[PDB]
Amino acid sequence: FDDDFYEFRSKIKELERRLASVITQGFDDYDTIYGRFKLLDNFEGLLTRPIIADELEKKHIVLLEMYKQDLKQVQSIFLEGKQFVDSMHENAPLFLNMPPIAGALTWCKSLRDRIQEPIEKLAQLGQGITEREEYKDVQKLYTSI
Amino acid sequence: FIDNNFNRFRNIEYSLKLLHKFQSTIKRDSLKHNLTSRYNAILHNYATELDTIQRVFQDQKSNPPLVRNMPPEAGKIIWARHLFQKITGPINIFPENVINSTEIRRYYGSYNTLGKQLTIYEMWFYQDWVNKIEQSKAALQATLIVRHDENKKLYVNFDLEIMQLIREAKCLDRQGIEIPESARIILLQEDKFKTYYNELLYALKEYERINSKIKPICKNLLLPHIEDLDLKLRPGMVTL
Amino acid sequence: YYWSQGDQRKKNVTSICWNPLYPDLFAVSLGSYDFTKQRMGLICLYSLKNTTHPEYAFNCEAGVMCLDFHPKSAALLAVGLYDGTVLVYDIRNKHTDPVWQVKWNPDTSKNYNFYSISSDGRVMNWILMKNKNEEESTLIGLACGLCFDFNKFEPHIFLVGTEEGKIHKCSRAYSGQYQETYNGHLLAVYKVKWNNFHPRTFISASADWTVRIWDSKYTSQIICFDLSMMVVDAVWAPYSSTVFACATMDKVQVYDLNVDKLNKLAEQKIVKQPKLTNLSFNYKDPILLVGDSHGGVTLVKLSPNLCKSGPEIKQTEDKKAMEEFKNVKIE
Numbered sequence: 120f121d122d123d124f125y126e127f128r129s130k131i132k133e134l135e136r137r138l139a140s141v142i143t144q145g146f147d148d149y150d151t152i153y154g155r156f157k158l159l160d161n162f163e164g165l166l167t168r169p170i171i172a173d174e175l176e177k178k179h180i181v182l183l184e185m186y187k188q189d190l191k192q193v194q195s196i197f198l199e200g201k202q203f204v205d206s207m208h209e210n211a212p213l214f215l216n217m218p219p220i221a222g223a224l225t226w227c228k229s230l231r232d233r234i235q236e237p238i239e240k241l242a243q244l245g246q247g248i249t250e251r252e253e254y255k256d257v258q259k260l261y262t263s264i
Numbered sequence: 265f266i267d268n269n270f271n272r273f274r275n276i277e278y279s280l281k282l283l284h285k286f287q288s289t290i291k292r293d294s295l296k297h298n299l300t301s302r303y304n305a306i307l308h309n310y311a312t313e314l315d316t317i318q319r320v321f322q323d324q325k326s327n328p329p330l331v332r333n334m335p336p337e338a339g340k341i342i343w344a345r346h347l348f349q350k351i352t353g354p355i356n357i358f359p360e361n362v363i364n365s366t367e368i369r370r371y372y373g374s375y376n377t378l379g380k381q382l383t384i385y386e387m388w389f390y391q392d393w394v395n396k397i398e399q400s401k402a403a404l405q406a407t408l409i410v411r412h413d414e415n416k417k418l419y420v421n422f423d424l425e426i427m428q429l430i431r432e433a434k435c436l437d438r439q440g441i442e443i444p445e446s447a448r449i450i451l452l453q454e455d456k457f458k459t460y461y462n463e464l465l466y467a468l469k470e471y472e473r474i475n476s477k478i479k480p481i482c483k484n485l486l487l488p489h490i491e492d493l494d495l496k497l498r499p500g501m502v503t504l
Numbered sequence: 505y506y507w508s509q510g511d512q513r514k515k516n517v518t519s520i521c522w523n524p525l526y527p528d529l530f531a532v533s534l535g536s537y538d539f540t541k542q543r544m545g546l547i548c549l550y551s552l553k554n555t556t557h558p559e560y561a562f563n564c565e566a567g568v569m570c571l572d573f574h575p576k577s578a579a580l581l582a583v584g585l586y587d588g589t590v591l592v593y594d595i596r597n598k599h600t601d602p603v604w605q606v607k608w609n610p611d612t613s614k615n616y617n618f619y620s621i622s623s624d625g626r627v628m629n630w631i632l633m634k635n636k637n638e639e640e641s642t643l644i645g646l647a648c649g650l651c652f653d654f655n656k657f658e659p660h661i662f663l664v665g666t667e668e669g670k671i672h673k674c675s676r677a678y679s680g681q682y683q684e685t686y687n688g689h690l691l692a693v694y695k696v697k698w699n700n701f702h703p704r705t706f707i708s709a710s711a712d713w714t715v716r717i718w719d720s721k722y723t724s725q726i727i728c729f730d731l732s733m734m735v736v737d738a739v740w741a742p743y744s745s746t747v748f749a750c751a752t753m754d755k756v757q758v759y760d761l762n763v764d765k766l767n768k769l770a771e772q773k774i775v776k777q778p779k780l781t782n783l784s785f786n787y788k789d790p791i792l793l794v795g796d797s798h799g800g801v802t803l804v805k806l807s808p809n810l811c812k813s814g815p816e817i818k819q820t821e822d823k824k825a826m827e828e829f830k831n832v833k834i835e
Contacts, residue, residue: 272765275713278730278731329537329797331516331518331535346711430600
C-alpha cells in the first residue's frame with residue numbers, strides 16, 4: 120500500500136500540478152470578470168476531487184481579496200462618478216429618453232445584479248470556498264452594501 | 265599506506281577521513297601503535313593549518329578585496345564567525361585521542377587564546393555597529409524623514425537612511441541577529457519611501473518626455489496648458 | 505597571445521564563457537571597483553581571431569551580472585540584474601534580494617524560459633516574446649540554496665548546496681515534491697556541476713574544501729574527495745577525460761582521475777598577474793584563457809596534456825563503476 124502510495128501520490132500530484140497550473144490559468148487567461156468566470160464555471164466536475172482543494176484552499180485567499188476589491192469598486196462606481204465618465208446614483212441627466220428616475224433605477228438594477236453575482240459564488244466551491252470565515256467577513260459587508 | 269593516511273591528502277581532516285575508513289584494522293592493536301606515531305603528524309599539520317588561519321586573521325576583514333552585498337561590519341563579523349567555526353572543528357577533534365600525550369593540549373592553549381581574542385574583537389565591532397544605527401536614527405534619521413519633493417528635479421533627502429536600514433535588516437536577518445522594533449519599522453517606512461520615489465521618478469520623466477516633444481514647436485495652445493500643469497506643494501504634505 | 509586590458513586595468517574578472525553558435529567567440533564579464541573610468545557593469549564580446557581588445561560591447565552605467573545567452577543560437581542575451589530584476593537584449597541590434605544564478609530552458613517552439621536564483625535562494629522563472637524583457641510573467645519556487653544545478657537529461661530536477669550544511673534536491677513540478685537532501689558528506693556546499701558524459705553523475709563542492717560525486721541514482725555520494733580551494737569554481741573538462749580543476753590565488757589544481765588517483769594531477773601558479781580569476785577551456789584547442797583580479801586577460805597552451813585517447817573514452821563508464829567500487833571499499 121505504501122509503495123503504491125509513494126509512486127501514485129507523487130505522480131497523481133504531478134497531475135494535480137497541471138490542475139493547479141490551470142487554477143493559475145484561471146486568471147492567466149482572461150482580463151474580464153466573465154472571461155474568468157467562463158473558466159470558473161468551466162471547472163465544475165472539478166469539485167468532486169479533493170486534490171484541487173489544496174491549491175484552491177491556497178489560492179482562495181488571494182482570490183477572495185481580489186474579488187472583494189471589484190465589489191467595492193462597483194460600490195464606488197455607484198456612489199461616485201468614475202474616471203472615464205460620471206456614474207452616480209444621482210445620475211446627472213445629460214440627456215432624457217425615459218423618466219430620469221427610471222434610468223437611474225435601471226443603472227442601480229444593473230449594479231445590484233453585478234453585486235449579487237459574486238456573492239452566491241463564494242458559498243460554492245468552483246467559485247467559492249465553502250463558506251470559510253474570511254467569506255463571512257467579506258459577506259457581512261457586501262450584504263450590507 | 266599508514267603514511268598515505270595523510271599523504272592521500274594535504275589536509276589533516278581528510279587524513280582523518282582515511283583514519284575513519286580504517287575500521288577493519290581496529291581489531292589489531294598495532295595500527296594503533298602506528299596511529300600513535302601518526303597522532304603527531306595529525307597535530308602538526310593541524311598546527312600548520314591554524315598558523316595559516318592566524319596569518320589570515322592578522323590580515324583582518326578590511327584588508328582582503330571583498331565583492332558582495334554585505335556591509336563592511338556584517339562581512340567582518342561573519343568572516344570572524346566563519347574563521348571561528350573553521351577553527352572549532354580542529355580544536356574539537358584535538359582531544360580524546362591525544363589528550364594522553366597533551367601535545368594537543370599545548371596547542372589548544374594558544375587556540376583557545378585566539379578564540380577568546382576573536383570573541384573580544386567581535387564584541388568591539390558590535391559595540392561599533394549595533395547602537396550605531398540607533399544613534400543615527402534617534403539623532404538625524406528618525407526625526408520625520410522628509411519625503412522627496414521637486415523644484416527642478418527630484419531631491420532625495422534620506423537616501424543614506426534608505427541604504428543603511430536596507431543593509432541593516434538584510435544582514436541581521438541573514439546572520440540571525442535580533443532586529444530592534446525601531447529598525448524593522450523604519451525599514452518598512454524606507455521601503456515605502458523607495459517605492460514612492462521610484463513612482464515619482466517615472467512621473468517626472470513622463471513630464472520630461474512630453475516637454476521634449478512639445479518644445480520643438482512651442483505652440484501657444486500647449487504652452488499655456490503646460491503653465492496650467494503647474495502645482496504647488498505646501499509644508500503640510502511633505503509628511504504624507 | 506591576446507591579453508586584454510581595454511580599460512580593464514582596475515576591474516576584476518567575474519565570468520568567462522564561450523559561444524556554441526560561434527565556436528570562435530567568447531564573452532567575458534567583469535566587475536569594476538574604480539568609477540573614474542569609462543562606464544559601469546560589463547559585458548564584452550570578442551572572437552579568437554579578432555583584435556585583443558573587445559570587439560563589441562554594451563555601454564551603460566548599469567552594473568550587470570548573471571549573464572547567459574540564447575540556447576539555440578546567439579540571438580538573445582539575458583542578464584540578471586543586481587536588484588533582482590532581469591533584462592534581455594536583442595543581439596541582432598545595436599526587490600531586497602539580488603539574483604545569484606541564471607539559466608535558459610530551451611523550448612524550441614518559441615522563446616526560451618528563464619530561471620534566476622536570487623541571493624536568498626528562492627527561484628524565479630518566466631519568459632515573454634516581447635523583450636522590451638517584461639518581468640510581468642513570473643513564477644516562484646521555494647528554494648533555499650544559491651547555485652542550482654539542473655539534471656542534464658531531465659531538466660526539471662535540480663539540486664543545490666545550502667549554507668545550512670546540506671544539499672537539497674527538488675524539481676519543477678512541485679517546489680515541494682521531493683524535499684529530501686543529498687548527504688554525501690553533508691557540508692555547506694556552494695558549487696555544483698554535472699559530469700558531461702554518459703552517466704547521471706554530478707558534483708558538489710563545499711566551503712570546507714570538499715568535492716562530492718553526487719550520482720543521481722544514489723543518496724550516498726560516490727568518492728568523498730577532498731582538497732583545499734574547493735569552495736571556488738569547479739568544472740568538468742571539455743575532453744573525454746573526467747578532468748577536474750579548482751583555481752584561486754593565481755594557482756590551479758587539476759585532476760585527471762582517468763589516469764591517476766584522486767591526488768592532484770597538476771598544479772600551476774601564474775606570475776603574469778596575481779590572483780587569477782575565472783577561466784575557460786574550449787574543446788577545440790588547449791589555448792586555455794583566464795582573467796586576473798586586475799581585470800586583464802591571458803592564455804597559455806600545454807598540448808602534451810591534451811588527451812590520452814585510450815583510457816578516457818570508453819573506459820570512463822567502467823571508471824564510474826570503479827568509483828562505486830571504491831564506495832563499496834569505503835564500506
